[PDB]
Write a protein that binds this ligand. Structure first.
Ligand code: 3PE
Ligand code: 3PE
Ligand code: 3PE
Ligand code: 3PE
Ligand code: 3PE
Ligand code: LFA
Ligand code: LFA
Ligand code: LFA
Ligand code: LFA
Lengths: 55, 100, 480, 101, 162
């Protein structure tokens, strides 16, 4: 049951999560300038809304 | 007798409309037009704020703003002309080669 | 206020760089000579460094309602001038491969350095805005200097459009701040408030829009998506300048703005910057995981390293040595980025025209360029925060500053992002020494090699013995 | 709020209104009456006009307050005009303003 | 000066709303010129006489001339964008309009609740702007000359024909 190290695998799963999160985040780098402008405006909305909420 | 809130709201409306024009338009010329609307709106907001305080600094900030607007309109139109003469196409979605 | 002769002494690097712009432009008007105009540019920048010595012999004072000169300004002026000199040195062989006019490059580098110096001394919203634009527009020219190449034109268009939008955001935020507070100087932003009314909604909205513009300029999440495309598309000396001088100058003026403004110690702005720093560290490291392109990898690296700097900025209004941490980290980051982007520039020089490929192909670099491979692996270890490198000294400063201010989420973010950096930086540094199947002779290429070698030696020596750099940074303190 | 200033405001408004209405009425009468049956040098000169027009605006602001600025303002405007003229000399010498190469 | 401010702000808003949703570039630039003239009238209503004069002289008289020059020399006669009108499709504009409306709502909420004695509208002359410009704002003027030089050099290097 242990011949393929289970504790090593459950310590390896942060690397799996990091690779998955990196592949997911790389979808935002699609190379489209209109999306870059849109993401800047989204970030502006988020920053202003956070500042108004926090006051 | 004119409120500061009304002038700032007018400037905010123009800025938001220019940003919308920059986002929704696929032609690079209309993106430059939206940029010009945004920078003119920010300069108008500076003029409104300076007129509220009775200070000349608002018009000085306007002068620096329109210096920037003129120079970056020149640069953006030069790049637009280069894109037109190299691709015969002003679609901004076509110039998307570099990607993650 | 009027300008006394002592004030003219304090403006010495700015005056010398402006005079160098005029002299280089008139020399181009005389005769288009690459060597003479490059030499005049580097002579002007070295004269600006010696003028920094003369400024240090003078006092620290407010030269205008706009500018304030002190040790802080001197340190950032020195960093910007070193980055500009390295950019010119890396640019000469690459421009020697170029076919069109190749002196407007040095004119634009000088004007961008002038903007960096203005941001180093900027004490006013007008000077901040003007310094950002004086950095930005020559970089519009420099990123698309090889506009016949598809990638450089694409990067130029993206950078121009997004920086114009970010300047609009920054200017609108400045206008809202000026609507709230009747003065545009840094020390008066939030001055007319009290009894727990520091978080005025208009002041916070103006600082939010300014944060949008500055966080575009600093490649901070979520204004970071331009960075790998522009870094990959730009010419490699332009990528060197864009990674070092622009980021250093803009972060210095952000540091001074948050030091001097009475709204700098705001809980809402601190929380927003903590969110931006956390996201910047994690996202930059995670996106750099699976990059085979070295320039995109260094773009995501710049995102994460500016996140670490932002963590050092968040602890500014609570602790004391946040300025010292930012100075030490910026010196280390400057030298590491100069080495890395200089190796990328030297192996991509001379320019191969708009039609030929410009991929780095760093695999097996040791078997034909061993010294550049050693410099590149020293820089990869330094950007990873490995001990015996100055990047670790900066990372240690960031961790100490975060621990002192009880920023535990940011401390854990730095640790996790550092582990992810370990992975991809070590991937590059060990791919340098493998075996690749397949795929100079002038003193300016040798000068670029000497620049990257001296950067590597500085990184190693100041990683082992960091006390001289700490002592230099600690005496470069602004007006309290 | 004096009588003279409001009189001149009304006179200027009537001047603009009657002028534009006269042009409009001229075109309306013309249309109603009667029976029925490139090269990049232009961009360069326009861009040069824009840049030198902004620098001209700086000189417009200076020219109305020369006595109030003193000799210090003269030195600053002289540096401004010198940079402006060096840019013009550079444009002439590199062939940017040469229309027939 | 109040009625003029409100009617000119209304004209500017309507004109730029027509700008961003128009297909003909020359018509869009004409509506942009109208919005700039309206904004100059807004400037004149607030007493910023120099700013309104420069809004017509520079913004509506130099920059938009450059835009009209570029549009006329590129000869946009419907190159695969006019025949599509993708920005009028709901899925393209509805999202960003929602995002911009949210940004406007947050900004306007920030504008309200700020103390306001009202804008006097007293004329701030060009003499005072010139005194401030060549007084406490000297380095702004010199480095703005450098900024315009940078724009000149960049635009010449990129936009020359050869
Ligand atoms: C070796 C360790 C690592 C070094 C890395 C350095 C990176 C940044 C480079 C620029 C840093 C400048 C920092 C200056 C801080 C000065 C702060 C200060 O207050 O200085 C005052 C001091 C005079 O003393 P004081 O009596 O206080 O003066 C007031 C009297 N009214 O006056 C001074 O202290 C004068 C300072 C003059 C500095 C001149 C620098 C010339 C350029 C040297 C470049 C060396 C090569 C580096 C690059 C290698 C290749 C990449
Ligand atoms: C993934 C790895 C990284 C993980 C994230 C980084 C570490 C997170 C640590 C969280 C600490 C939570 C502290 C909560 C209370 C904070 C406020 C407070 O009252 O702190 C107590 C004290 C300051 O209060 P004072 O009155 O001055 O008392 C001085 C004497 N202690 O505070 C102090 O005096 C200093 C408190 C120091 C706290 C511990 C710092 C060292 C952390 C060790 C490693 C991380 C924890 C163990 C490993 C977890 C799994 C990785
Ligand atoms: C017991 C709990 C309490 C104590 C906790 C102590 C925490 C610190 C010590 C443990 C750290 C565990 C790290 C586990 C991953 C180690 C790295 C690794 O395995 O790398 C190899 C792998 C590359 O190999 P391969 O998968 O073949 O290639 C894919 C790409 N072509 O690489 C990859 O696939 C990608 C690697 C990405 C970078 C490494 C992952 C970093 C994740 C965060 C590190 C910090 C974790 C903090 C604690 C989390 C919970 C335990
Ligand atoms: C002071 C007023 C200068 C106005 C200059 C206006 C101008 O553009 O002049 C053009 C003039 C001739 O240039 P061009 O016709 O191209 O030369 C062909 C001759 N082989 O250009 C010239 O004569 C050259 C400009 C001479 C003065 C500026 C350069 C030297 C400055 C030294 C410091 C004073
Ligand atoms: C009428 C309904 C709409 C019809 C179609 C559009 C026509 C144009 C409407 C806008 C322009 C006119 C608005 C009405 C102005 C009437 C004059 C006025 O209000 O004067 C007051 C003030 C005088 O200055 P002041 O000395 O401060 O006054 C206080 C006295 N102590 O004045 C000021 O301070 C400044 C006055 C305004 C600035 C000058 C005029 C600007 C014109 C901008 C035109 C924009 C483009 C219009 C295009 C229309 C077609 C689409
Ligand atoms: C302390 C500095 C650490 C970073 C620099 C590392 C480079 C040192 C100088 C180059 C040495 C390279 C040796 C490569 C040997 C490869 C052998 C492969 C076949 C076994
Ligand atoms: C995807 C990567 C995510 C990395 C997350 C890193 C988190 C590190 C651990 C942070 C723990 C913070 C605990 C703070 C407790 C504060 C208590 C204050 C009491 C007054
Ligand atoms: C009141 C009479 C004064 C007579 C002497 C005037 C000359 C001394 C003062 C000159 C100040 C000039 C300042 C120019 C700054 C230029 C900065 C350029 C930066 C690129
Ligand atoms: C090919 C990709 C084109 C993307 C165009 C821009 C899309 C922006 C969408 C933003 C929607 C925001 C809605 C509110 C939350």
């Amino acid at each position: 049951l242990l011949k393929r190290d289970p504790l090593n695998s459950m310590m390896n799963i942060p690397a799996v999560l990091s690779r998955f999160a990196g592949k997911g985040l790389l979808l935002s780098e699609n190379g489209y300038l209109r999306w870059y402008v849109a993401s800047m405006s989204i970030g502006a909305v988020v920053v202003l809304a956070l500042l108004m909420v926090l006051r | 007798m004119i409120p500061l809130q009304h002038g700032l709201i007018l400037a905010a409306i123009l800025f938001v409309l220019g940003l919308t024009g920059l986002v929704i338009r696929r032609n690079l010329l209309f993106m430059l037009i939206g940029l010009e609307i945004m920078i003119n709106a920010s300069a108008l907001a500076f003029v409104v704020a300076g007129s509220y305080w009775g200070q000349t600094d608002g018009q000085v900030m306007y002068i620096l703003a329109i210096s920037l607007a003129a120079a970056e309109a020149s640069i953006g139109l030069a790049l637009l002309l280069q894109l037109h003469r190299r691709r015969q196409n002003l679609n901004i979605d076509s110039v998307s080669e570099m990607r993650g | 206020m009027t300008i006394t002769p002592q004030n003219l002494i304090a403006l010495l690097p700015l005056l010398i760089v402006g005079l160098t712009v005029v002299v280089v432009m008139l020399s181009i008007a005389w005769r288009r000579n690459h060597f003479l105009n490059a030499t005049l540019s580097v002579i002007g920048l070295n004269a600006a460094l010696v003028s920094l010595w003369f400024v240090g012999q003078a006092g620290a004072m407010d030269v205008t309602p706009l500018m304030r000169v002190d040790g802080f300004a001197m340190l950032y002026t020195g960093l910007v001038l070193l980055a500009s000199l390295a950019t010119c040195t890396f640019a000469y062989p690459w421009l020697e491969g170029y076919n069109d006019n190749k002196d407007e490059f040095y004119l634009l580098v000088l004007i961008a350095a002038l903007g960096g110096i203005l941001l180093a001394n900027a004490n006013h919203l007008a000077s901040l805005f003007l310094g950002i634009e004086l950095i930005s527009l020559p970089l519009f020219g420099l990123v698309g200097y090889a506009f016949r190449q598809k990638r450089s034109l694409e990067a130029s268009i993206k950078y121009t459009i997004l920086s114009a939008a970010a300047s609009s955001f920054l200017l609108f935020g400045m206008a809202l701040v000026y609507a709230q507070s009747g003065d545009l100087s840094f020390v008066a932003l939030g001055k007319n408030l009290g009894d727990g009314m520091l978080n005025e909604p208009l002041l916070l909205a103006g600082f939010g829009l300014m944060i949008v513009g500055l966080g575009f300029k600093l490649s901070l999440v979520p204004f970071h998506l331009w960075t790998p495309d522009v870094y990959q598309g730009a010419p490699a000396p332009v990528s060197t300048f864009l990674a070092t001088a622009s980021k250093i100058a803009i972060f210095g003026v952000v540091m001074r703005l948050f030091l001097y403004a009475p709204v700098g110690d705001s809980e809402a702005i601190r929380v927003v910057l903590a969110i931006i720093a956390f996201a910047s560290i994690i996202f930059g490291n995670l996106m750099a995981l699976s990059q085979t392109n070295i320039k995109r990898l260094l773009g995501y690296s710049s995102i994460s390293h500016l996140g670490y700097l932002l963590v050092a900025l968040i602890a500014l209004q609570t602790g004391e040595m946040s300025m010292e941490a930012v100075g030490v980290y910026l010196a280390g980051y400057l030298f590491s980025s100069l080495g890395a982007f200089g190796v990328v520039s030297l192996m991509s020089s001379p320019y191969r025209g708009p039609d030929a490929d410009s991929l780095f192909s760093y695999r097996g670099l040791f078997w034909h360029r061993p010294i550049l491979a050693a410099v590149m692996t020293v820089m990869m270890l330094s950007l990873a925060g490995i001990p015996m490198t100055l990047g670790f000294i900066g990372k240690f400063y960031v961790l100490a500053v975060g621990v002192q201010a009880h920023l535990w989420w940011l401390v854990g973010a730095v640790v996790v992002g550092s582990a992810i950096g370990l992975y991809y930086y070590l991937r590059v540094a060990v791919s340098l020494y493998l075996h690749a199947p397949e795929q100079p002779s002038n003193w300016q290429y040798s000068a670029g090699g000497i620049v990257v070698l001296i950067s590597a030696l500085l990184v190693l020596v100041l990683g082992v013995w960091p006390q001289p750099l700490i002592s230099i940074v600690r005496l470069a303190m602004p007006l309290m | 709020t004096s009588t003279e200033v409001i009189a001149h405001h009304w006179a200027f408004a009537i001047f603009l209104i009657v002028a534009i209405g006269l042009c409009c009425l001229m075109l309306v009468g013309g249309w109603f009456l009667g029976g029925r049956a490139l090269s990049a040098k232009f961009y360069l000169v326009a861009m040069f006009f824009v840049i030198f027009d902004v620098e001209a605006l700086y000189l417009f602001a200076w020219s109305t307050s020369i006595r109030e600025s003193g000799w210090v303002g003269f030195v600053e405007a002289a540096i401004f005009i010198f940079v402006l003229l060096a840019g013009l000399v550079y444009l002439v010498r590199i062939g940017a303003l040469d229309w027939t190469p | 000066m109040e009625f003029a401010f409100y009617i000119c702000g209304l004209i500017a808003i309507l004109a730029t709303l027509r700008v961003i949703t128009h297909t003909n570039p020359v018509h869009a630039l004409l509506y942009l010129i109208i919005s700039l003239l309206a904004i100059s009238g807004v400037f004149f209503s607030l007493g910023a006489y120099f700013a309104g004069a420069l809004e017509i002289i520079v913004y509506a008289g130099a920059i938009m001339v450059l835009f009209v020059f570029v549009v006329m020399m590129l000869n946009l006669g419907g190159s695969e964008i006019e025949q599509e009108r993708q920005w009028l499709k709901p899925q393209v504009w509805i999202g960003p309009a929602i995002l911009s409306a949210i940004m406007l709502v947050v900004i306007v909420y920030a504008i309200l609740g700020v103390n306001d004695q009202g804008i006097d509208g007293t004329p701030i002359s060009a003499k005072a702007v010139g005194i401030t410009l060549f007084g406490p704002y000297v380095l702004a003027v010199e480095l703005a000359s450098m900024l315009l030089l940078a724009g000149l050099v960049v635009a010449f290097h990129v936009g020359r024909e050869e």
